[PDB]
């Protein structure tokens, strides 16, 4: 029964976690675009990279 509860809840948890990772990856990509155009510096890019990690 604990194995069945884990099967039932980890699909929802892992899909929420993949959406977490997709959101943080898109945030890092926008911070990289903001850096490459030239508005913010490289420290904020490294902070976004650590959040994605």
């Amino acid at each position: 029964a604990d194995g069945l509860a884990a099967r039932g809840t980890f699909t929802e948890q892992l899909q929420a976690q993949r959406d977490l990772v997709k959101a943080s990856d898109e945030y890092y990509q926008l911070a990289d675009k903001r850096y490459r155009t030239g508005v913010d510096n490289y420290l904020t890019l490294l902070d976004a990279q650590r959040s994605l990690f």
Partner: protein, 52 residues
């Protein structure tokens, strides 16, 4: 790609056009030196000479 908002883009565009207008006013205020003839025709003498 919405890396900034649309609103501070409009704010930066406003500051760009304001600084453009300030450069335009400095340029016409420098064009008011070397005083151009407003009309075309015949000219008299110079009541105000060099150095005055």
């Amino acid at each position: 790609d919405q890396a900034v908002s649309k609103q501070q883009y409009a704010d930066a565009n406003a500051a760009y056009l304001q600084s453009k207008a300030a450069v335009e006013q400095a340029r016409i205020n420098l064009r008011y030196t070397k005083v151009l003839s407003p009309i075309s025709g015949r000219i008299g003498r110079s009541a105000v000479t060099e150095g005055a």
